[PDB]
PDB file of C-alpha atoms and ligand atoms in Angstrom:
ATOM      1  CA  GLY A  18       0.026   0.107  -0.267  1.00  0.00           C
ATOM      2  CA  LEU A  19       1.864   3.261  -1.196  1.00  0.00           C
ATOM      3  CA  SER A  20       0.638   6.647  -0.707  1.00  0.00           C
ATOM      4  CA  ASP A  21      -0.114   9.143  -3.948  1.00  0.00           C
ATOM      5  CA  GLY A  22       3.192  10.683  -3.006  1.00  0.00           C
ATOM      6  CA  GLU A  23       5.286   7.436  -2.802  1.00  0.00           C
ATOM      7  CA  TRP A  24       4.008   6.792  -6.297  1.00  0.00           C
ATOM      8  CA  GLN A  25       4.725   9.939  -7.498  1.00  0.00           C
ATOM      9  CA  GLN A  26       8.652   9.342  -6.356  1.00  0.00           C
ATOM     10  CA  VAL A  27       8.031   5.578  -7.617  1.00  0.00           C
ATOM     11  CA  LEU A  28       7.523   7.522 -11.140  1.00  0.00           C
ATOM     12  CA  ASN A  29       9.722  10.021 -10.654  1.00  0.00           C
ATOM     13  CA  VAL A  30      12.438   7.399 -10.489  1.00  0.00           C
ATOM     14  CA  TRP A  31      11.186   5.252 -13.042  1.00  0.00           C
ATOM     15  CA  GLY A  32      11.841   8.131 -15.175  1.00  0.00           C
ATOM     16  CA  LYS A  33      15.342   7.495 -14.937  1.00  0.00           C
ATOM     17  CA  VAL A  34      15.246   3.904 -16.007  1.00  0.00           C
ATOM     18  CA  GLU A  35      12.713   4.826 -18.900  1.00  0.00           C
ATOM     19  CA  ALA A  36      15.762   7.327 -20.265  1.00  0.00           C
ATOM     20  CA  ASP A  37      18.193   4.351 -20.654  1.00  0.00           C
ATOM     21  CA  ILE A  38      16.048   1.327 -20.061  1.00  0.00           C
ATOM     22  CA  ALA A  39      18.368  -1.084 -21.995  1.00  0.00           C
ATOM     23  CA  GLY A  40      21.504   0.194 -19.861  1.00  0.00           C
ATOM     24  CA  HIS A  41      19.507  -0.027 -16.405  1.00  0.00           C
ATOM     25  CA  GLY A  42      18.093  -3.512 -17.330  1.00  0.00           C
ATOM     26  CA  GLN A  43      21.533  -4.762 -18.515  1.00  0.00           C
ATOM     27  CA  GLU A  44      23.062  -3.694 -15.048  1.00  0.00           C
ATOM     28  CA  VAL A  45      20.215  -5.097 -13.110  1.00  0.00           C
ATOM     29  CA  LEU A  46      20.730  -8.554 -14.264  1.00  0.00           C
ATOM     30  CA  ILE A  47      24.425  -8.347 -13.999  1.00  0.00           C
ATOM     31  CA  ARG A  48      24.247  -7.265 -10.698  1.00  0.00           C
ATOM     32  CA  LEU A  49      21.638 -10.141  -9.911  1.00  0.00           C
ATOM     33  CA  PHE A  50      24.196 -12.833 -11.627  1.00  0.00           C
ATOM     34  CA  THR A  51      27.348 -11.480 -10.166  1.00  0.00           C
ATOM     35  CA  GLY A  52      25.509 -11.367  -6.886  1.00  0.00           C
ATOM     36  CA  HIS A  53      23.906 -14.374  -6.995  1.00  0.00           C
ATOM     37  CA  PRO A  54      25.221 -16.960  -9.553  1.00  0.00           C
ATOM     38  CA  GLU A  55      22.490 -19.495  -8.526  1.00  0.00           C
ATOM     39  CA  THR A  56      19.854 -17.034 -10.425  1.00  0.00           C
ATOM     40  CA  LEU A  57      22.323 -17.265 -13.858  1.00  0.00           C
ATOM     41  CA  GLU A  58      21.454 -21.087 -13.655  1.00  0.00           C
ATOM     42  CA  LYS A  59      18.026 -20.521 -14.461  1.00  0.00           C
ATOM     43  CA  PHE A  60      18.443 -18.893 -17.665  1.00  0.00           C
ATOM     44  CA  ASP A  61      19.395 -21.523 -20.204  1.00  0.00           C
ATOM     45  CA  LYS A  62      20.329 -18.789 -22.609  1.00  0.00           C
ATOM     46  CA  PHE A  63      22.676 -16.853 -20.169  1.00  0.00           C
ATOM     47  CA  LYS A  64      24.550 -20.156 -18.249  1.00  0.00           C
ATOM     48  CA  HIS A  65      26.884 -20.055 -20.976  1.00  0.00           C
ATOM     49  CA  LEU A  66      28.394 -16.576 -19.698  1.00  0.00           C
ATOM     50  CA  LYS A  67      31.190 -17.148 -17.328  1.00  0.00           C
ATOM     51  CA  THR A  68      32.628 -13.754 -16.738  1.00  0.00           C
ATOM     52  CA  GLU A  69      31.195 -10.293 -16.131  1.00  0.00           C
ATOM     53  CA  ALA A  70      32.923  -8.975 -19.651  1.00  0.00           C
ATOM     54  CA  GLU A  71      30.768 -11.693 -21.636  1.00  0.00           C
ATOM     55  CA  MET A  72      27.698 -10.644 -19.440  1.00  0.00           C
ATOM     56  CA  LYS A  73      28.681  -6.873 -20.403  1.00  0.00           C
ATOM     57  CA  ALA A  74      29.079  -7.723 -23.830  1.00  0.00           C
ATOM     58  CA  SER A  75      25.741  -9.743 -24.465  1.00  0.00           C
ATOM     59  CA  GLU A  76      23.387  -7.971 -26.368  1.00  0.00           C
ATOM     60  CA  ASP A  77      20.736 -10.805 -25.616  1.00  0.00           C
ATOM     61  CA  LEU A  78      21.383 -10.118 -21.910  1.00  0.00           C
ATOM     62  CA  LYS A  79      20.474  -6.305 -22.561  1.00  0.00           C
ATOM     63  CA  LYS A  80      17.642  -7.351 -24.707  1.00  0.00           C
ATOM     64  CA  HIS A  81      16.343  -9.295 -21.919  1.00  0.00           C
ATOM     65  CA  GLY A  82      16.656  -6.408 -19.427  1.00  0.00           C
ATOM     66  CA  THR A  83      14.973  -4.181 -21.633  1.00  0.00           C
ATOM     67  CA  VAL A  84      12.005  -7.022 -21.706  1.00  0.00           C
ATOM     68  CA  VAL A  85      12.335  -7.303 -18.046  1.00  0.00           C
ATOM     69  CA  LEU A  86      12.251  -3.496 -17.088  1.00  0.00           C
ATOM     70  CA  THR A  87       9.749  -2.832 -19.320  1.00  0.00           C
ATOM     71  CA  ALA A  88       7.470  -5.489 -17.714  1.00  0.00           C
ATOM     72  CA  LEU A  89       8.589  -4.116 -14.385  1.00  0.00           C
ATOM     73  CA  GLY A  90       7.569  -0.503 -15.428  1.00  0.00           C
ATOM     74  CA  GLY A  91       4.025  -1.437 -16.930  1.00  0.00           C
ATOM     75  CA  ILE A  92       3.582  -3.033 -13.493  1.00  0.00           C
ATOM     76  CA  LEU A  93       4.758  -0.054 -11.322  1.00  0.00           C
ATOM     77  CA  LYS A  94       2.621   2.625 -13.976  1.00  0.00           C
ATOM     78  CA  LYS A  95      -0.672   0.739 -12.773  1.00  0.00           C
ATOM     79  CA  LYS A  96       0.043   2.172  -9.088  1.00  0.00           C
ATOM     80  CA  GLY A  97      -0.613  -1.666  -7.214  1.00  0.00           C
ATOM     81  CA  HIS A  98      -3.758  -2.489  -9.677  1.00  0.00           C
ATOM     82  CA  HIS A  99      -1.368  -4.803 -11.492  1.00  0.00           C
ATOM     83  CA  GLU A 100      -3.557  -7.964 -11.185  1.00  0.00           C
ATOM     84  CA  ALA A 101      -3.731  -8.383 -14.894  1.00  0.00           C
ATOM     85  CA  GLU A 102      -0.060  -7.672 -15.412  1.00  0.00           C
ATOM     86  CA  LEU A 103       1.057  -9.300 -12.469  1.00  0.00           C
ATOM     87  CA  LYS A 104      -0.522 -12.945 -12.901  1.00  0.00           C
ATOM     88  CA  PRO A 105       0.981 -13.900 -16.077  1.00  0.00           C
ATOM     89  CA  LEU A 106       4.520 -13.133 -14.633  1.00  0.00           C
ATOM     90  CA  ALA A 107       3.777 -14.881 -11.567  1.00  0.00           C
ATOM     91  CA  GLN A 108       2.509 -17.874 -13.245  1.00  0.00           C
ATOM     92  CA  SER A 109       5.353 -18.208 -15.992  1.00  0.00           C
ATOM     93  CA  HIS A 110       7.882 -17.351 -13.206  1.00  0.00           C
ATOM     94  CA  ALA A 111       6.760 -19.756 -10.942  1.00  0.00           C
ATOM     95  CA  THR A 112       5.324 -22.643 -13.745  1.00  0.00           C
ATOM     96  CA  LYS A 113       7.723 -22.378 -16.257  1.00  0.00           C
ATOM     97  CA  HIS A 114      10.925 -20.832 -14.900  1.00  0.00           C
ATOM     98  CA  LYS A 115      10.598 -21.942 -11.507  1.00  0.00           C
ATOM     99  CA  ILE A 116      12.153 -19.025  -9.985  1.00  0.00           C
ATOM    100  CA  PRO A 117      12.044 -18.877  -6.207  1.00  0.00           C
ATOM    101  CA  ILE A 118      10.807 -15.919  -4.725  1.00  0.00           C
ATOM    102  CA  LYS A 119      14.016 -15.260  -2.910  1.00  0.00           C
ATOM    103  CA  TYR A 120      15.387 -14.520  -6.457  1.00  0.00           C
ATOM    104  CA  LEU A 121      12.508 -11.606  -6.590  1.00  0.00           C
ATOM    105  CA  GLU A 122      14.075 -10.204  -3.887  1.00  0.00           C
ATOM    106  CA  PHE A 123      17.656 -10.750  -5.193  1.00  0.00           C
ATOM    107  CA  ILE A 124      16.337  -8.824  -7.973  1.00  0.00           C
ATOM    108  CA  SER A 125      14.430  -6.049  -6.117  1.00  0.00           C
ATOM    109  CA  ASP A 126      17.425  -5.121  -4.012  1.00  0.00           C
ATOM    110  CA  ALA A 127      19.567  -5.372  -7.373  1.00  0.00           C
ATOM    111  CA  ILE A 128      17.460  -2.365  -8.675  1.00  0.00           C
ATOM    112  CA  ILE A 129      18.013  -0.388  -6.011  1.00  0.00           C
ATOM    113  CA  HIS A 130      21.569  -0.660  -5.891  1.00  0.00           C
ATOM    114  CA  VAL A 131      21.800  -0.098  -9.442  1.00  0.00           C
ATOM    115  CA  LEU A 132      19.799   3.166  -9.219  1.00  0.00           C
ATOM    116  CA  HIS A 133      22.413   4.537  -6.554  1.00  0.00           C
ATOM    117  CA  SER A 134      25.305   2.949  -8.607  1.00  0.00           C
ATOM    118  CA  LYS A 135      23.795   4.979 -11.776  1.00  0.00           C
ATOM    119  CA  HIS A 136      22.562   7.980  -9.943  1.00  0.00           C
ATOM    120  CA  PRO A 137      24.701   8.589  -7.153  1.00  0.00           C
ATOM    121  CA  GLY A 138      23.438  11.330  -4.947  1.00  0.00           C
ATOM    122  CA  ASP A 139      20.015  11.678  -6.974  1.00  0.00           C
ATOM    123  CA  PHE A 140      18.370   8.934  -5.594  1.00  0.00           C
ATOM    124  CA  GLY A 141      17.226   9.964  -2.435  1.00  0.00           C
ATOM    125  CA  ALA A 142      15.998   8.585   0.829  1.00  0.00           C
ATOM    126  CA  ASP A 143      12.331   9.318  -0.151  1.00  0.00           C
ATOM    127  CA  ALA A 144      12.830   8.012  -3.392  1.00  0.00           C
ATOM    128  CA  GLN A 145      14.250   4.891  -2.214  1.00  0.00           C
ATOM    129  CA  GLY A 146      11.897   4.255   0.381  1.00  0.00           C
ATOM    130  CA  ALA A 147       8.942   4.434  -2.360  1.00  0.00           C
ATOM    131  CA  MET A 148      10.611   2.402  -4.663  1.00  0.00           C
ATOM    132  CA  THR A 149      11.515  -0.390  -2.247  1.00  0.00           C
ATOM    133  CA  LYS A 150       8.018  -0.438  -0.737  1.00  0.00           C
ATOM    134  CA  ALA A 151       6.818  -0.779  -4.684  1.00  0.00           C
ATOM    135  CA  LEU A 152       9.152  -3.427  -5.013  1.00  0.00           C
ATOM    136  CA  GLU A 153       7.864  -5.142  -2.149  1.00  0.00           C
ATOM    137  CA  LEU A 154       4.115  -4.744  -3.097  1.00  0.00           C
ATOM    138  CA  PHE A 155       5.298  -6.424  -6.359  1.00  0.00           C
ATOM    139  CA  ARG A 156       7.284  -9.267  -4.829  1.00  0.00           C
ATOM    140  CA  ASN A 157       4.381  -9.587  -2.318  1.00  0.00           C
ATOM    141  CA  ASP A 158       1.616 -10.058  -4.537  1.00  0.00           C
ATOM    142  CA  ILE A 159       3.956 -12.459  -6.629  1.00  0.00           C
ATOM    143  CA  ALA A 160       4.218 -14.149  -3.477  1.00  0.00           C
ATOM    144  CA  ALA A 161       0.185 -14.306  -3.054  1.00  0.00           C
ATOM    145  CA  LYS A 162       0.266 -16.091  -6.530  1.00  0.00           C
ATOM    146  CA  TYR A 163       3.438 -18.597  -5.490  1.00  0.00           C
ATOM    147  CA  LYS A 164       1.251 -19.660  -2.342  1.00  0.00           C
ATOM    148  CA  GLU A 165      -1.687 -20.339  -4.342  1.00  0.00           C
ATOM    149  CA  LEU A 166       0.405 -22.594  -7.018  1.00  0.00           C
ATOM    150  CA  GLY A 167       1.795 -24.237  -4.003  1.00  0.00           C
ATOM    151  CA  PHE A 168       5.172 -22.888  -5.587  1.00  0.00           C
ATOM    152  CA  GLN A 169       8.408 -22.998  -3.550  1.00  0.00           C
TER     153      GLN A 169
HETATM  154  C1  LIG B   9      11.476  -7.566 -11.587  1.00  0.00           C
HETATM  155  C2  LIG B   9      11.177  -9.122 -11.718  1.00  0.00           C
HETATM  156  C3  LIG B   9      11.313  -9.794 -12.967  1.00  0.00           C
HETATM  157  C4  LIG B   9      10.396  -9.369 -13.841  1.00  0.00           C
HETATM  158  C5  LIG B   9       9.488  -7.966 -14.126  1.00  0.00           C
HETATM  159  C6  LIG B   9      10.411 -10.489 -15.040  1.00  0.00           C
HETATM  160  C7  LIG B   9       9.791 -10.576 -16.314  1.00  0.00           C
HETATM  161  C8  LIG B   9       9.951 -11.399 -17.374  1.00  0.00           C
HETATM  162  C9  LIG B   9       9.389 -11.405 -18.654  1.00  0.00           C
HETATM  163  C10 LIG B   9       8.266 -10.661 -18.968  1.00  0.00           C
HETATM  164  C11 LIG B   9      10.009 -12.473 -19.026  1.00  0.00           C
HETATM  165  C12 LIG B   9       9.458 -12.962 -20.707  1.00  0.00           C
HETATM  166  C13 LIG B   9       7.884 -13.553 -20.585  1.00  0.00           C
HETATM  167  C14 LIG B   9       7.884 -14.759 -19.414  1.00  0.00           C
HETATM  168  O1  LIG B   9       8.162 -15.832 -19.783  1.00  0.00           O
HETATM  169  O2  LIG B   9       7.215 -14.222 -18.343  1.00  0.00           O
HETATM  170  C15 LIG B   9      10.924 -13.268 -18.236  1.00  0.00           C
HETATM  171  C16 LIG B   9      11.050 -14.413 -18.383  1.00  0.00           C
HETATM  172  C17 LIG B   9      11.919 -15.098 -17.791  1.00  0.00           C
HETATM  173  N1  LIG B   9      12.466 -14.748 -16.262  1.00  0.00           N
HETATM  174 FE1  LIG B   9      11.841 -13.106 -15.541  1.00  0.00          FE
HETATM  175  N2  LIG B   9      11.309 -11.188 -14.372  1.00  0.00           N
HETATM  176  C18 LIG B   9      11.396 -10.839 -13.479  1.00  0.00           C
HETATM  177  C19 LIG B   9      12.276 -11.560 -12.453  1.00  0.00           C
HETATM  178  C20 LIG B   9      12.905 -12.838 -12.782  1.00  0.00           C
HETATM  179  C21 LIG B   9      14.306 -13.503 -11.850  1.00  0.00           C
HETATM  180  C22 LIG B   9      14.744 -12.987 -10.444  1.00  0.00           C
HETATM  181  C23 LIG B   9      14.602 -14.570 -12.227  1.00  0.00           C
HETATM  182  C24 LIG B   9      15.492 -15.627 -12.275  1.00  0.00           C
HETATM  183  C25 LIG B   9      16.378 -15.342 -11.251  1.00  0.00           C
HETATM  184  C26 LIG B   9      13.847 -15.028 -13.860  1.00  0.00           C
HETATM  185  C27 LIG B   9      13.982 -15.785 -14.856  1.00  0.00           C
HETATM  186  C28 LIG B   9      13.419 -15.755 -15.997  1.00  0.00           C
HETATM  187  C29 LIG B   9      13.664 -16.729 -17.142  1.00  0.00           C
HETATM  188  C30 LIG B   9      14.457 -17.551 -16.850  1.00  0.00           C
HETATM  189  C31 LIG B   9      12.737 -16.247 -17.965  1.00  0.00           C
HETATM  190  C32 LIG B   9      12.907 -16.815 -19.532  1.00  0.00           C
HETATM  191  C33 LIG B   9      14.330 -16.150 -20.021  1.00  0.00           C
HETATM  192  C34 LIG B   9      14.086 -16.901 -21.424  1.00  0.00           C
HETATM  193  O3  LIG B   9      14.394 -18.306 -21.481  1.00  0.00           O
HETATM  194  O4  LIG B   9      13.877 -16.363 -22.293  1.00  0.00           O
HETATM  195  N3  LIG B   9      12.930 -13.664 -13.883  1.00  0.00           N
HETATM  196  N4  LIG B   9      11.106 -12.416 -16.804  1.00  0.00           N
END
């Protein structure tokens, strides 16, 4: 449950991401994969990436980063009214990709890390609070769908 002012902060922060969705998406995934190498194993199409240099050079990783952040941005712009947008992602990530909710926590924190890394001094405490709450809401609603599906 975010206030109007918190959603305003979220969407203000998101404008930073939308200016360079592929660069943000790439860095989010690289942060996820390098911080939590087990997550790489969930991607048949990225498990060949042995080094961060290879990850950085991967155009397909940037492409997927764009897909991920485009989806997330579409969800965030719903300001919590995202059941229709979230449902297929929860279902695909539980049933097809088999992504534990822990990895969604990892990527949520990776987003925060990337925002500070790319916008140092420009991702204020209020913005971090609002973005964190929005990612918690996202993760929590996914978690509810995971529970429905019995997925761990
Ligand atoms: C912000 C959180 C995430 C968003 C918005 C997101 C979004 C997406 C989207 C839109 C797709 C393609 C459509 C689909 O298959 O449903 C996808 C595919 C996929 N996602 Fe995610 N995802 C997120 C987090 C994760 C995490 C944390 C993992 C694993 C650690 C993961 C693993 C995968 C895999 C393996 C695929 C299939 C990739 C392929 O083979 O093309 N996702 N994701």
